[PDB]
Design a protein around this ligand. Structure first.
Ligand SMILES: O=C(O)c1cc2cc(F)ccc2[nH]1
Ligand SMILES: O=C(O)c1cc2cc(F)ccc2[nH]1
Lengths: 302, 304
């Protein structure tokens, strides 16, 4: 019976959300998050905060969800058969930020906790999450700083923690049919429970704080970079690739929509505008081609 | 076999001509842009011709593809619905198209005709046909929906009293976004695993279906292409094309199977719109012609 450990987690997630929103509002200075609190048939709910048409953030969502349920949904019994009929609690923050300026990267973060209550056995549980950076017109110094924040926050938890979860981020956020990474990586983890519960929780706190320390400065630094409408077009074609990942490959997006999740809360990840063209490529040799030729394939920043 | 090999080739030839014919008709309606052909050759066996059209007077993004692929043993994600024929030599061919008009008052449309054949040693071959056609309007007109369906009902009739009912029903169940509780378009025809009839009969049906597409769709384009439209209308169109992307990337099996089994990405994804939009809790204004698409047309389902 972890009810109080779970409440501590809940209290943190709600605070992280406030903390990310406030910070992002402070960067925009024009628009604020509008909140949409929701509920489901015997399944808790969430508080979806969205920002649209700001000075800096064109489309942005920072969601809190807390899902109850009797028996895991149908899709999870393929991955988690051993606890398919269990009472479960799932709670987390998910965010995707799509800046107006192409020179500010898109970014994503997640912290979450799954707890399954067992008949006779102590409860099964794991954390999960990460953050990652999806530049359009990348900047070396930004990528390095991003990753450095990730490695630094990992340092207190073990010597191999960054390596493992950085690599996991590279493997996960990849479009195999296009042989192409989605962004320049960051951290990614799941089924985190090898450490005692308190050490894992502290880790996800560090990942939550880590996001704001990694991303906010990059937004402050590049938001006022001047951009042409040609660069917006490139950005819109790149967002096609983002839509693909989220709709074709992403496991949480897929599981969110299969199992009865709130569509509009799940799909805050989709960009404001996206373009697709037959055989679309950026002109090789340009800043536009450099993203895929250099930035997406480096996979070694720190 | 001999008879099947001879028949398979009659099917190819039909498909190659179907494509020229569809492209010609579509070029005839545009007047301005013409299809560009991109021939490609699978490393393993076969290939295809992808024909696309961009920035037309009428067709903003158009894709009419032909494939004929063939190999030793099926791909890895075909050991799940067809494990018993995963080591067989196979042939899969077909024509697949998606048309996205510049004008919002011209519906997007899609059509597909294909054949899969798996040659088996000593046992008769396994084979089936599949495909159909469907209409995805933005600003739907009643008369066009009825007509589109009558053309489908008419081509089916000679094949049997219940054929239109099955494949029109199937179209509604298939092209549907469950998580949004929302149809994709106003329907049409859809069928898969078609081998219930002798080969020759199934084949003639897909030929009817293929001809049906031009008969159903080209008049509608000709009728609507010069309808005046606003930037506000194009904006609704692009939000609606978010739903279209959604279906193809999240739900469509053909896209799933193609992308995960080593098919040619840009060819598979001609289906995707030139521009799309998403907004959190975006819905058309109630009481507007925009809202009428989802409130009426998409839930109507009964046209003929
Ligand atoms: O695997 C999951 O269940 C899951 C992945 C994921 C990613 C997000 F960004 C948000 C919620 C999620 N849930
Ligand atoms: O099920 C398939 O293999 C398949 C479905 C499909 C749909 C299209 F529009 C085009 C080709 C296809 N192949």
């Amino acid at each position: 019976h972890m009810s109080l450990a779970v409440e501590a987690v809940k209290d943190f997630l709600l605070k992280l959300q406030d903390d990310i929103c406030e910070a992002l509002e402070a960067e925009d200075g024009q628009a604020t998050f509008v909140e949409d609190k929701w509920t489901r048939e015997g399944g808790g709910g969430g508080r979806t905060r969205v920002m649209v048409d700001g000075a800096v953030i064109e489309k942005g969502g920072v969601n809190f969800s807390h899902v109850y349920g009797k028996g895991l949904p149908m899709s999870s019994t393929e991955r988690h058969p051993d606890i398919a009929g269990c009472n479960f609690e799932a709670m987390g923050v998910s965010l995707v930020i799509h800046p107006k300026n192409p020179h500010v990267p898109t970014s994503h973060a997640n912290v979450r906790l799954f707890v399954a209550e067992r008949e006779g056995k102590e409860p099964v549980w794991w954390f999960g999450g990460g953050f990652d950076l999806t530049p359009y017109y990348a900047v070396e110094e930004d990528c390095r700083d991003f990753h450095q924040v990730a490695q630094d926050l990992c340092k207190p938890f073990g010597a191999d923690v960054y390596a493992r979860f950085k690599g996991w981020c590279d493997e996960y956020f990849f479009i195999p049919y296009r042989n192409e990474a989605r962004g320049i990586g960051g951290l990614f983890f799941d089924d985190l429970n090898e450490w005692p519960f308190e050490k894992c929780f502290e880790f996800v706190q560090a990942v939550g704080k880590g996001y704001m320390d990694a991303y906010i400065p990059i937004v402050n630094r590049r938001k006022n970079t001047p951009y042409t409408e040609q660069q917006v077009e490139f950005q819109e074609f790149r967002r096609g690739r983002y839509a693909e990942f989220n709709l074709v490959i992403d496991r949480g997006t897929k599981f969110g929509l299969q199992s009865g999740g709130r569509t509009e809360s799940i799909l805050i990840s989709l960009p404001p505008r996206a373009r697709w063209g037959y055989n679309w490529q950026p002109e090789p040799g340009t800043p536009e081609a450099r993203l895929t030729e250099y930035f997406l394939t480096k996979r070694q920043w720190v």
